[PDB]
Every structure is written in C-alpha cells, then in structure tokens.
C-alpha cells in the first residue's frame, strides 16, 4: 500500500508540521483526539479500533517546542514516545548538531524509523522538513539524512527546506549553517523543494492582502503545497502522480534536484466573490514571478521542467488548453533540449480550507513544482554571503571547538561552487 513517513527536524520543522498535521486531520475528518467519527493509510496508521496516529517523528534538540505540542491541542493525536525532545539545542551551530550533541540523539531517531517503517507495508518515500538556517535543522538533518541513505537505498526523500532570504533573515550565522548543509543535501536528498521566507512574506502581503502576519500564516500556507504534492496517494484523480513520478519527471541529472514551488489561487475571503477562477486564469497566475515560493526571478533563467499538479474540478482538456497558451508565451522560456517540459496531474478534491485560516474556499487549485536554472541565484547569493564572512574568519571558533575541523568549510565552499558551475552548464544553448 502507498504510504509515506514524514520527518520534522528543527524549530521550523515542528511548526511546519504543526500546521501540516492540522490540515491532514481536517481533510480526512480526523478529530484532534485521534478518533474518526480507506484513504487515511498514507499518513495515519489504523491502531486498534477507532484510533489513528500520524506517520511522523518530531525530533528537536531544544525541548521548548516538543512539549508545546505535547501540551497543545494535539496531545491525544500523537504517540507520546513518537515525539523526541532533547536536553539542549544545537543553538545555530552545525557542528553541535553533527558532532557534539547530534550523535547522542540520532540513535533514538533511527529507532523510531524502524518501528514506523516496519509498521508500514510498502514505504513509498520520506518527507524531511528542516530549515538550514538553524543548528538542529541543518546539523541533525545532515546526520539523519546520512544514516537514512546508508540504511534505505533507492527510497525517495522529499526535502522541504527554508533557505535564508537575501534581505530578510533572522540569524547571523545562517550563511555558515546553510553552506555546510549543502554538502549533505545534494548527495543524499533525492528531491529538494526550496522555500524562502520573504517570498512567502510577499505572497501574504499582496495576494492575501493581510498587513501584519506571522510565522503561523506561513506554515499554514506552506502546508497547502505539501498536501497538494501528495494528494494523489490520498484521493483518486484522472492523472494520478506518485512520489516516484516527481522523482523522475523533474530531475534531468542526479546533482540538479532543487525545484521551486507555487500555488495558483491565493485569494482572501473578501476577494473570492469578485474574482472568477478558471483553469486558464489560475495557470497564468501560477506562472507569475511574484507567486513563487523563493525569491529568484524566473525570467533571469530558464525553466528546466515543470510539474503542474491540479486539484478539484479540473477537466483534462483545460490543463491542456492552458498549457497551450503557456508554451506560446515568450516571457516563459525553456531550455532548448527539453521539448516536452510539463508534467500534469489532476486529482478531484478541492483543497480543504482550515477554519481560522486566511485562505478562502476555491473550487480549483494548481501546485506547480518546477526545476529551473534561476535557482543558481539563491545559491550564488548565499555563496556571496559566506565567502565575505569567511574571508577574515568570523564565527569560526565556535565551529572549530565543537569537533568540526577548519577544512570542512573549504570542502563545503568548493562543493557549493561546483553547483554554481552546474546550473550554468546545464542552461547553455547548443
């Protein structure tokens, strides 16, 4: 049976999954106490009689966010030992999450993976959630993805990461934590979907027209894409696409596996009645540069391969009629050697709108996850953010003393510069 195990690492991973599991209980009618008053097997395992538990692990070195979930409204939903706390955090240090304190807790992390993978009949993929700007998300994530690669070969891993924005970022050592995190996630993660905070800030500012929103509104809006990406394993549609179909229709090369994401109808409650939504209209809105989830302008590069995944009442000619006008448009430009560049997927539920959420009820939806050569800009900016700080060796003695040697920064710098050459080489016209 189709089923997928989610892994939530770091402060962002717990809060994204807090909004992600809030949605998944709603779309299957699962009450917060864990009792439902066929399709739930991909995220909920049927335990005993009238009880479902999520297929997740909540690991975070800082104990202040796990117990918030433990004392929260979803106390009865989660298995108590399924959520892993810790004594002290990595505290924005990659070396602590990888060498000093990460090695102690990672043994408990893989042990719950045994029980979750043995309980699941046919595992189909892994959903790893982290923010590389922190110590626990990047450090423990690189350690966790190292052990999951040696223990589970050829199994797909979906990585939803939060890179720092060029303007809007929180921690000073985020360029240090991001560059070292790339040395693992290229050669371990199979499919990575990049997210950025300020791009979601811009989506919330204009499309939702809400003036002063917070992280709770981002995580609610991130979980829409997470739900829409795996909506095929849950609910039937004309063109079902599995987690191994994004894993092959989007990546042309093994080391190019970073993708953008977008969500077409982003309309508030007051704007829904005035706005007419059509399949041609939202597909044009899905390809707008302002609706991207990472601040890289797609006009600078070329789209490698796009995967439009639809929801709701979308007829199969209207995805074909929409993409006919998309290919004729001159602003959108593909690489020359990829004539067929689209993957289409049509499910049948409309997206389940959460109570108290700013997003309105929409009959149709599009989730476009696309590989593009403009992703080199979000890597080159952090490349520029890091060598400028590593030039006179600032914030290095914290990393040096915690087990990490000096040379790992040089290896991570060289590895990231190899990715810069790869995106430029693959976009060359011949």
């Amino acid at each position: 049976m189709r089923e997928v195990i989610s892994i939530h690492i770091g402060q962002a991973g717990i809060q994204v999954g807090n909004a992600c599991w809030e949605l998944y209980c709603l779309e299957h009618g699962i009450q917060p106490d864990g009792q439902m008053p066929d399709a739930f097997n991909t995220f909920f395992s049927e335990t005993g009689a009238g009880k479902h538990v999520p297929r997740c692990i909540f690991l975070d070195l800082e104990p202040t966010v796990v117990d918030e979930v433990r004392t929260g409204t979803y106390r009865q939903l989660f298995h108590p030992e399924q959520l892993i706390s810790g004594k002290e955090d990595a505290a924005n240090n990659f070396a602590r999450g990888h060498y000093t304190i990460g090695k102690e807790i990672v043994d408990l992390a893989l042990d719950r993976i045994r029980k979750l993978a043995d309980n699941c009949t046919g595992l189909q993929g892994f959903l790893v959630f982290n923010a590389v700007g922190g110590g626990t998300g990047s450090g423990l994530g690189s350690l966790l993805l190292e052990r999951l690669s040696v223990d589970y070969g050829k199994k797909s891993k979906l990585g939803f990461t939060v890179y720092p924005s060029p303007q809007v970022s929180t921690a000073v050592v985020e360029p240090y934590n991001s560059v070292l995190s790339t040395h693992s996630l290229l050669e371990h993660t199979d499919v990575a979907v990049m997210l950025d905070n300020e791009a979601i800030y811009d989506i919330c500012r204009r499309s939702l027209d809400i003036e002063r929103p917070t992280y709770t509104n981002l995580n609610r809006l991130i979980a829409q894409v997470i739900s829409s990406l795996t909506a095929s394993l849950r609910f039937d549609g004309a063109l079902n696409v599995d987690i191994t179909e994004f894993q092959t229709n989007l990546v042309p090369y093994p080391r190019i596996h970073f993708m953008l994401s977008s969500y077409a109808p982003i309309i508030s409650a007051e704007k829904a009645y005035h706005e007419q939504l059509s399949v041609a209209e939202i597909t044009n809105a899905a390809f707008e540069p302002a609706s991207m989830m990472v601040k890289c302008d797609p006009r600078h590069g070329k789209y490698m391969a796009c995967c439009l995944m639809y929801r709701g009442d979308v007829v199969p000619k209207d995805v074909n009629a929409s993409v006919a006008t998309i290919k004729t448009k001159r602003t959108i430009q593909f690489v020359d050697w990829c004539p067929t560049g689209f993957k289409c997927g049509i499910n049948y539920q409309p997206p389940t709108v959460v109570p108290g959420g700013d997003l309105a009820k929409v009959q149709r939806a599009v989730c476009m996850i696309s590989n593009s050569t403009a992703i080199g800009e979000i890597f080159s900016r952090l490349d520029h953010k890091f060598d400028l700080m590593y030039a006179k060796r600032a914030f290095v003695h914290w990393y040096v003393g915690e087990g990490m040697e000096e040379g790992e920064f040089s290896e991570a710098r060289e590895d990231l510069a190899a990715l810069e050459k790869d995106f430029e080489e693959v976009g060359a016209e011949s």
Binding site: D38, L233, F235, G237, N240, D313, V315, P316, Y348
Partner: protein
C-alpha cells in the same frame, strides 16, 4: 464449504459518477451524445418573459427591452407577405 471471510476494503478514495472529471456524455449509447447534454445556444439570448416573471412590475428596463423586441418584430414584418399566407 470452507471459511467465508470478506476481504477488507482498502483503496483510494473513489468518487461518484457526478464529478466533472468522470462524467460520460456517451454512456451505453455506442458513440452518440446523450440527451440533456444539448449544444450551447448561440449568445444565450434570454427572453423578456423570464425577466418579467421575476420582477414584480414591468419596470422601465422591461419596457425598453420589450420596445427593442417590438422594433425587431416591426423590422421583420414585411407588409406584403403574411406569415404562412401569400401576397395580399
């Protein structure tokens, strides 16, 4: 004869025949489009009767639309050939 056990219903959340993605306008008719799926009429010209029946009084909008239809009918009339009868 042996133990009768019903297999558990495990499957993807199926949907009814009423959805737009699975509606079949040629169902059991061998490649002919079914009734109640008639062709779209051109321009969808609603008559004034459907508007008068929903308004309470013949307002100025209804009166003007009836005047437009009367002008159309007066343009159609020929004064030499009656409808179904010959010259004069």
């Amino acid at each position: 004869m042996f133990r009768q056990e019903e297999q558990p219903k495990t499957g993807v959340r199926q949907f009814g025949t009423h959805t737009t993605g699975k509606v079949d306008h040629m169902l059991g008719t061998h490649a002919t489009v079914r009734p109640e799926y008639k062709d779209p009429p051109p321009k969808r010209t609603v008559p004034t009767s459907q508007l008068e029946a929903v308004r309470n009084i013949e307002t100025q909008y209804i009166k003007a639309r009836k005047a437009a239809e009367d002008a159309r009918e007066r343009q159609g009339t020929s004064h030499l050939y009656a409808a179904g009868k010959g010259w004069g």
